[PDB]
Amino acid sequence: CSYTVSRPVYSELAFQQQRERRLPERRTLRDSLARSCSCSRKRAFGVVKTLLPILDWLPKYRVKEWLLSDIISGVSTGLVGTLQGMAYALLAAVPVQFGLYSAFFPILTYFVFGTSRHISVGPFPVVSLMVGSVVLSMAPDDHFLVPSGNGSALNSTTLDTGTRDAARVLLASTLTLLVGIIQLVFGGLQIGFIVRYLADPLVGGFTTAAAFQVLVSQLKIVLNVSTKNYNGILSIIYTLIEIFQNIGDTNIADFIAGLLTIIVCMAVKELNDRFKHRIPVPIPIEVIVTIIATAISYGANLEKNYNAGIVKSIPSGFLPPVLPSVGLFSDMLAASFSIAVVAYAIAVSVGKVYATKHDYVIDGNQEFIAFGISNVFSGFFSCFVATTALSRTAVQESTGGKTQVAGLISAVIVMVAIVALGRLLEPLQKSVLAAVVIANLKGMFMQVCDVPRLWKQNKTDAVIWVFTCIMSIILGLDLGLLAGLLFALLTVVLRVQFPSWNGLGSVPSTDIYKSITHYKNLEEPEGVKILRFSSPIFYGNVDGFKKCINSTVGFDAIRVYNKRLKALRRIQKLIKKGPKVPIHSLVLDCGAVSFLDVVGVRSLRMIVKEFQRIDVNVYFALLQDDVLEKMEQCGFFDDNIRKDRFFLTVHDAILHLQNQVKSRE
Amino acid sequence: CSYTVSRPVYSELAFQQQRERRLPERRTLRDSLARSCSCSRKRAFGVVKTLLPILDWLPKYRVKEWLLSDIISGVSTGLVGTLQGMAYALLAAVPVQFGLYSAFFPILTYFVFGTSRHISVGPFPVVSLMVGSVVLSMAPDDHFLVPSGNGSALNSTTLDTGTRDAARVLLASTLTLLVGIIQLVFGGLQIGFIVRYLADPLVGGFTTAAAFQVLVSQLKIVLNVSTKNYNGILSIIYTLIEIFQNIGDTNIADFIAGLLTIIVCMAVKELNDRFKHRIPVPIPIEVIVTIIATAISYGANLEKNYNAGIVKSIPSGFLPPVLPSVGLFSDMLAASFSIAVVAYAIAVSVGKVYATKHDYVIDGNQEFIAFGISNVFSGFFSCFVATTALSRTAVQESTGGKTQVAGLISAVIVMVAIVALGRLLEPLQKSVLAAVVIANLKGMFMQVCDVPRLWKQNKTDAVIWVFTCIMSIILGLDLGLLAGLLFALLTVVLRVQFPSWNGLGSVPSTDIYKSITHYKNLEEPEGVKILRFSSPIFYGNVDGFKKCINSTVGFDAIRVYNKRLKALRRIQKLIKKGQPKVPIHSLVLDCGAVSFLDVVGVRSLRMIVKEFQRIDVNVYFALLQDDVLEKMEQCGFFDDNIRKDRFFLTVHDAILHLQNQV
């Protein structure tokens, strides 16, 4: 239809006179905290069901086919998880048994406190890399070597194989306990807005840099070289240079086997991902490649005849729980916070993906509490921080998963592979386990293809991705996240400090105002210059507003007044002996403002007063109600600056100006 | 007065089909790189005029209240400048001989280059310890340590003199020159937007603990409490408790001397403010309490008969310029960057605290090159850094003062005090001049009265003011402004992340849409609701924008879809076996106050439209003027079905569209 209205010009005061405002509710802090404290059984049952979601999906089971679905998904997920754990155990500088330990206890702890259905809690390459890095920084290799072995010239300060692994495991357990404590603190205090700052490009660049560092570390492990655990600034570049300079001390057989298994696994994964319509169940290439590697490595003495690198350090048993060594929290609090926040970000991402894929809800604070409790329980049993891997979660989702019971069954596989099974994997080469990690890096390596897409989009979003990826390589990986979040906040501040001001004008015989820099056939009021200023004025962008006003009016309220004062004294001396031509009004269309930052309202009142001396009226067009209520308390409506200066709509100001010009020449 | 705005409802595609756009100018730098100043002499004369801020106020001052006012004010800050030069020089582990030069030469080059009044360039308390820190690190205390002097048992390892202090001044001279050239090279690329981040409560909360820092630094000299040097964290607390712990060895004669002078100097100060209409010219009590103190000290010998503490070490005569060591600039370069940044912060912070009481707003780019060449001019003469003390700028502004010429005449007082008035201020008790800074310090101590004022105006800046005040006490003045600057920017990103979202509603028989939580007797369209976020949808408020919708519509778009298919699968199996939705039709997001969008926002906003589309509830939008509209279509917001027809120019056009549709 059509749009036509008829109403008087209610600028600021003609609207608030016949409009009874809504009185705010009484605070009553005592009764507020008293009423908020729930005591009925309904709220108690609700918070119990929320805190322990296990009692929710259990009574409504569909055992009939869910039993078989969960048992097959559980055996598949258990195989995949024990393989990923025995692969990532090298990234934590701990023996291979602790990876399987951390692949068993966190699942049992999440089964009774989790709220998702497809999230496979377990090891993660990025988290394991960060744990290994902080362990090497806190416990280097050259800090445990013992002189023994009757050396030739000096004391035989060989490796400390033995008690060194116990110290590393205790350090990892303390780190996991601190991470769990930090996560529980973030969850219980309802502080969950801190993880909102991890933007999608930021986390993408961080995952890309972490995958690059994981590739570097796995190539170091495959080549079987001896580095000096370079950590700190340019650690990845320095260790890559050291690898390139230490090529001579490699293993040709291990390198050939690693390249072969890498090619095979990549080809099989690509074939399964591309031709999915012909094979419904993904072929567990990891399982078969591990089986064939253990079979080939057992036939011949690859440890003696080829000098390969195997584990051969599997005790095949459990251990009583050990209390963590408290006292190292002050020097690892930042690392624990970084690990916790990156793990929570990755977990929330995976959960949202697999939830919008299956159309169910996942709570954030509940997942935070669940991961915190899981890490706390793992810290008491010599385990590292657990997360959800994209590759491990994809297998459980492809095999068919409904509830966390498949995860409970997934622990049974690791369970039987810890107590009795496991010693058969003795001659397995470490390069084989170090290869599947590289093969799983294809997902995060293809994330670089977004920069050509993001560059065509908003350019500031692409700068954050490149900055996060590059900075997380120079000053390590842990400090790179802190340098990325601050950079993202600074980029946000830059977008609100430099707004997009225009020359808003009116279309002929209309009421809507559009910009003049993007249109040609627009009419402007005679003398009146309209200006719109988004990105509300604060202490940092007030000079920007001054410059924008000076540019849109053509002159300066200071220089014109100084010239007027200089010409005024010339008149008083001549009688004793014997610029602002086109500008008529200035309508500020501050309709996109949210806050005011009274430090800036001072300069706004200063501008209004300065333009009054040069007889140039400066009005307002579309100020919000809350903004005006805030400016009223900030001391802006004095005896001269009344409410008639403000307006409700942009057209009302122009209409009032036209009426005043017609009625007063 | 009524007005006829009869016009059919216009959407985006219905408004761009009859109008025309404008070709945006790319403005490539391959041919437009010489458009700033090629041959026009007007632009050349402009940059020279701004480069020399001497042709602006000097040919413009009025001599009515200029001659007598600035002279009596110059000697006031000139006397204080002499004490700071004689005090801060000892703390820098260098001989106390060049303190007077740092207040004479840098003022001359700043008198012509630099437009910032009420500032006395010279040494600063917290910057003198930083110089003494880097000197003792890269230079041992004993250079040669000649073991001679026929000691008790072994050779008397006497500390070498003459050559030791000469190298210390040479090292300090190279440091000031290295900071100067670094201070000047920053002005090349014109980084002057950093001063815009220093808010009035930021500099107000900063120049209130520094007034407390300069209070405790002047309290240990007025009480003669030998305390150790402390810097970094808890510097003010450790020095405060040391005075109270070492209060025993306090000069009783010097205590009653300073206590009697601090009262009489502040009493006459407020008396001049009360009788300012009677006596036109303010009485310079600073020069009065100075000459009477030398009389009671020289006529009674307060040093050798009362042990009160005097200067008694005033040098005489200038020194020729000495060339620095270029081969040592590489070592000080790693440490001068930290000192150069904190110097410029304190230098401009004392200019903004006085910019609120007088309309003298300055620019950071001009002050960066002004103080830059001043420290360069400070070089080659073995001077100190060209900072500005907080005590000298207070005694000049509170006790009169019109322009920067008060610093020029102050150097003249220092000029005659070194060549002809050296023996004059010899018995100065170092108390009447170390406590006179406390009298003029009330101008900054009374600045804490804005806490109840700012709290009633806006809660955010009130927290910023008290935060920077308490943080500068613990983390010191060095990291205090740095931590407060990040906290000030944090309040900007928080206010833009959690806006004041409210549901809007029209007024009867009109098209004005205002908030319903602040007004009454409003009405809402049956089945159509209005939501105004009034904030940009960036990566931080992505879920906050979702929580704003589900809390306003009553339901949650996520839980109504899974329960819909749950009931759908429930009734489906019953057919083979045998047999809370709000009536709101659509919602119009009044997201007109958005200023920018990101890739996370355009993706999340697309998911919201697709989410409500599956629930048979449409979602419409509001005015996206120039940027937030073109950015969405560039990020791939319209793929197959979502079109620009769902948008609207005005909020009322959205209501009229849903009205005639049903």
Numbering used by the authors:
A (entry chain A): 18 to 595, 651 to 737
B (entry chain B): 18 to 596, 651 to 733
Can you quote the paper on this entry?
Similarly, the pendrin sample in the anion pair of Cl−/I− (1:3) (pendrin-Cl/I) was prepared and used for structure determination. Symmetric inward-open and asymmetric homodimers were observed with approximate percentage of 75 and 25%, respectively. After superimposing all structures we resolved, we found very little difference among inward-open structures or among outward-open structures, respectively, with root mean squared deviation (RMSD) no more than 0.5 Å. The asymmetric homodimer consists of one inward-facing protomer and the other outward-facing protomer, representing coincident uptake and secretion- a unique state of pendrin as an electroneutral exchanger. Considering the significant cross-section area increase from inward-open state to outward-open state, we hypothesize that when one protomer is outward-open, the other one would be inward-open to minimize their effects on the outer leaflet. Therefore, the coincidence of secretion and uptake in this asymmetric homodimer shapes the molecular basis of the electroneutral exchange of pendrin with an inverted alternate-access mechanism.
